[PDB]
Amino acid sequence: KHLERIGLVYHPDYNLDLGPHVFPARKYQMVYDLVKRDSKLSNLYIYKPDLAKTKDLSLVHTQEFLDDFFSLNITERTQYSELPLTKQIVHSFVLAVGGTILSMELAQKYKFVYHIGGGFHHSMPDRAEGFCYLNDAAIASKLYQKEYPDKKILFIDLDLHQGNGNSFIFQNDPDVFTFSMHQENLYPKKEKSDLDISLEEGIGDKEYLELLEKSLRKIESDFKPDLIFYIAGADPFEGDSLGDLKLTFQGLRKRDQIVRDFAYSLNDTRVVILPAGGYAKDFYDTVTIHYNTIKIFAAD
Ligand SMILES: CCCCCC/C=C/CCCC(=O)O
Ligand SMILES: [K+]
Ligand SMILES: [Zn+2]
């Protein structure tokens, strides 16, 4: 009964100008600004992380990989990232891992924590890929598991792309369940999640949401989570420049509402919400979709 509805995590140093790169790495500050500009949401508490500890990074990542990451070294461990490797990028990723860990800690007092940052679901123990250098949700999961050895974690991954890093890290862990709905013909090389729904180009709201509702029933038939990481990507949007799925703004809202309501129906459960991707042709649509997720989870 102590639980408050929703808190936010953010750090302004997440934001980077990546120049011509496809990834809108300044989305975070504008999602944050839309929150600040809203008279309802501007009343939520915002928490700021410190840099994640290297010892915590090591719960998921190999020392060889961390050596290459921190030294800005170009090797097989870093060269598949599809991103530059600069001190600013290192700094932004280590802060964001700190943010996702903080979000998970905040789930002790909030039903929902929306992290305006993170969702690095392609990051592997020994190699970066898919614009992801460190695995924020995997690291936070390992910490949560040390705190609560009996508790269970569900990843609901509704970003356009499979959460392969998470599927791989948790493939032999019975206390973690990975669920993903993703476009099948895109990056990445597919791992075996606990439940994968392979989507075809052109899927619309009705079919997508039907598959989601069915999938959540399937999950709960097999698995009762205490903590959920909801990877609430913006990239299934019909206007996305990378994806070919055709979810509307209202479809993405309904998606978020379905996940929200699934959590509400499980009394002990808490949710950390992570934005992951989004490549709308209009940058402002990406921002708007993430803002809409916050508004959904914050709703009366
Ligand atoms: C903040 C600067 C660094 C770029 C952050 C990249 C985050 C990638 C997230 C997942 C990609 C996707 O699933 O579409
Ligand atoms: K996904
Ligand atoms: Zn994505």
TrEMBL record:
Gene3D superfamilies: Histone deacetylase domain. CDD domains: HDAC_classIV. GO terms for molecular function: histone deacetylase activity; hydrolase activity. One of its GO terms (biological process) is epigenetic regulation of gene expression. The keyword Acetylation does not apply. Coiled coil: none annotated. Residues 21-285 form the Histone deacetylase domain. This is Histone deacetylase. It comes from Leptospira interrogans serogroup Icterohaemorrhagiae serovar Lai (strain 56601). The lineage of its organism: Bacteria, Pseudomonadati, Spirochaetota, Spirochaetia, Leptospirales.
